[PDB]
């Protein structure tokens, strides 16, 4: 596993010893090369796992997430290259350093044979994101957004550390392999109920759950484009990965325990999809769509059936790519308009046709159009929920309809109609932005040819 980690570490001296006008070129090239290196991990077995050593292992749940995390960095660099133009070399190098550290923490988090190491890296990812949000942020509310993002996470995760150390004191090991082979039932007891809550709520807050989703609109709206990309694409999937990893110890307690969460998510997807209909902001709308998708992923994980797990993995990957693309499009609009409100700049299809095509493709893939992997996860989760209960479909049905609505709403408000007469600084779209959208969208349509590559270990 070090064949990926060591180049990521070497990214830092290379960036800091780079010539003042060659940081972006060097960083993008080596990030793409590291991504290519990460592709080797995809060739998984139907057997246990790819246990490299005592510290790191690979799994077909971990491999797609690792590949996506590696692939995201060149896109984030290309997106950040624009608005950091009037900035000193030292601070640009610091920004690139923070992105590299975030990638390194995520890579070590996703392998993480041991749960305490997983927790340490899972919370280590918090510092670079907080600094990126609160330092290179435009508005004055970035401080409040950073405070919300930090404290929601820590309030959720502090009981998790106590639960983990207690579990190691009783069982004797926190290793994933040992835990899976030596799993024993949890008696329905008050202490076991609170242990379940402590083990689950930390990953529930980061999805986030409908009750605890407030930090996310603030963090997404106030963060720069790279911050929004990394939050929507990878950082939200940490909770799902943690739940899928930790749920094994929880049974048979999960069935009784799951109802409050199942109801919250099934109603919160409807609530957030409906909130998307009445929004005056692109970034907030994308954030609420992300909340709805992750609520569906929560439902899938809580049902805890094979089809549920495959659907959850596919939906996580597809949502990461789609939400990153949507945030990139919104940022391209914002860098021209400087308002970040949908109703101001209108009729952009007439002025920017190719960018309108990119908008259409992104909205279609957010809409879960078949045979895209978005709908693959959608349908697997829906079928698993129907087997769980024949009434869930009704809610699911509403969700699908509402989703389509706001997606096309976002496509119609900004691209169709008549262009605002006063705005005249809408310059032709650059090659960099078109390349960014192409690199976002091509992997989805390539992955729909090989869905099993992202369907997880239960395939």
């Amino acid at each position: 596993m070090l064949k990926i980690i060591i180049p990521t570490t070497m990214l830092l001296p290379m960036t800091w010893m780079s010539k003042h006008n060659m940081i972006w070129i060097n960083a993008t090239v080596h990030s793409l090369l590291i991504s290519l290196i990460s592709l080797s991990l995809l060739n998984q077995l139907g057997e246990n796992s790819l246990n490299f050593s005592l510290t790191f292992f690979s799994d077909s749940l971990s491999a797609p997430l690792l590949v996506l995390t590696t692939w995201l960095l060149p896109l984030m660099l290309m997106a950040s290259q624009s608005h950091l133009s009037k900035e000193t070399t030292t601070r640009k190098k610091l920004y690139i350093t923070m992105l590299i550290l975030l990638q390194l923490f995520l890579i070590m988090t996703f392998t993480a044979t041991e749960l305490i190491l997983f927790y340490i890296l899972f919370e280590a990812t918090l510092v670079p994101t907080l600094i990126i949000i609160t330092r290179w942020g435009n508005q004055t509310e970035r401080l409040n957004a950073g405070l919300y993002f930090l404290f929601y996470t820590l309030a959720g995760s502090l009981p998790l550390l106590v639960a983990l150390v207690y579990i190691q004191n009783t069982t004797g090991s926190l290793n994933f392999l040992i835990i899976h082979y030596w799993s024993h039932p949890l008696s329905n007891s008050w202490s076991n109920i609170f242990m379940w809550l402590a083990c689950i709520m930390a990953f529930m807050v980061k999805m986030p759950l409908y009750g605890l989703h407030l930090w996310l609109p603030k963090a997404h709206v106030e963060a720069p484009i790279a911050g929004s990309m990394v939050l929507a694409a990878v950082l939200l999937k940490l909770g799902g990965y943690g739940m899928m990893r930790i749920t094994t110890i929880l049974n048979p307690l999960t069935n009784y325990m799951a109802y409050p969460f199942l109801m919250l998510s099934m109603w919160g997807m409807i609530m957030t999809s409906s909130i998307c209909l009445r929004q005056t902001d692109l970034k907030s709308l994308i954030a609420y769509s992300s909340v709805s998708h992750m609520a569906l992923v929560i439902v899938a994980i809580m049902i805890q059936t094979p089809w549920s797990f495959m659907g959850a993995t596919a939906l996580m990957i597809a949502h990461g790519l789609t939400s990153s693309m949507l945030f990139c499009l919104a940022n391209t609009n914002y860098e021209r308009v400087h308002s970040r409100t949908m109703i101001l700049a209108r009729g952009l299809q007439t002025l920017l046709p190719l960018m309108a095509t990119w908008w259409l493709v992104a909205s279609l893939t957010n809409l879960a159009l078949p045979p895209s992997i978005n709908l693959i996860g959608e349908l697997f989760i829906i079928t698993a929920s129907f087997s769980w209960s024949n009434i869930t479909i009704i809610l699911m049905g509403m969700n699908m309809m509402i989703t389509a609505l706001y997606s096309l709403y976002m496509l119609i408000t900004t691209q169709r109609g008549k262009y605002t007469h006063h705005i005249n600084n809408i310059k032709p779209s650059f090659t960099r932005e078109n390349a960014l959208m192409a690199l976002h969208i091509l992997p989805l349509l390539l992955l729909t040819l090989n869905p099993k590559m992202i369907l997880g270990p239960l395939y």
Binding site: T350, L351, G417, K418, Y419, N424, K427
Partner: protein
């Protein structure tokens, strides 16, 4: 659409507008030309009966009462011209209406084609730059103190002057650009 609106509508403006709406809706009701002509003349004759009435209160009583009758028999699906705000081709060609300043963003290889057009455009830009600087002062001196009362603009009064705020009225894209 071109002229500025008024602070209100007089009684005669209201009766003329009611006459227009009623005649259009009767034409919608009467598909054939002879039937429409007969009923339109009958309606015109009925309308002219109260023409010399002088009582303002009576005048208010007239037309408003007619408006209720018009609303009752208003032909729920009236005829609308295709390009009218209710027509089937109201905004068909708004997607083809590209602003003029977009030409300022063309690549030089594109501006190599159509050189005479861009030369004339440069002359237009020079004229606009001079005329706007004149127009700012002209409108500042001609506007009434405390702000304008009616959104109508004065014409040019000197020899070399141009109409104030003319650039975006003269440079409309077209009705049917493509």
């Amino acid at each position: 659409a071109f002229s500025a609106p008024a602070a209100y509508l007089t009684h005669q403006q209201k009766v003329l507008r009611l006459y227009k709406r009623a005649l259009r809706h009767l034409e919608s009701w009467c598909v054939h030309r002879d039937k429409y002509r007969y009923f339109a003349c009958l309606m015109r004759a009925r309308f002219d009966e109260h023409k010399n009435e002088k009582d303002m209160v009576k005048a208010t009583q007239l037309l408003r009462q007619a408006e209720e009758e018009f609303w009752y028999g208003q032909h729920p699906q009236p005829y609308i011209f295709p390009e009218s705000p209710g027509g089937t081709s109201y905004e068909r060609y708004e997607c083809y209406k590209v602003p003029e300043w977009c030409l300022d963003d063309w690549h030089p290889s594109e501006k190599a084609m159509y050189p005479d057009y861009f030369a004339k455009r440069e002359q237009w830009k020079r004229l606009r730059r001079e005329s706007w600087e004149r127009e700012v002062k002209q409108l500042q001196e001609e506007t009434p103190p405390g702000g304008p009362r009616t959104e109508a603009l004065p014409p040019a009064r000197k020899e070399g002057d141009l109409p104030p705020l003319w650039w975006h009225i003269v440079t409309r894209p077209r009705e049917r650009p493509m």
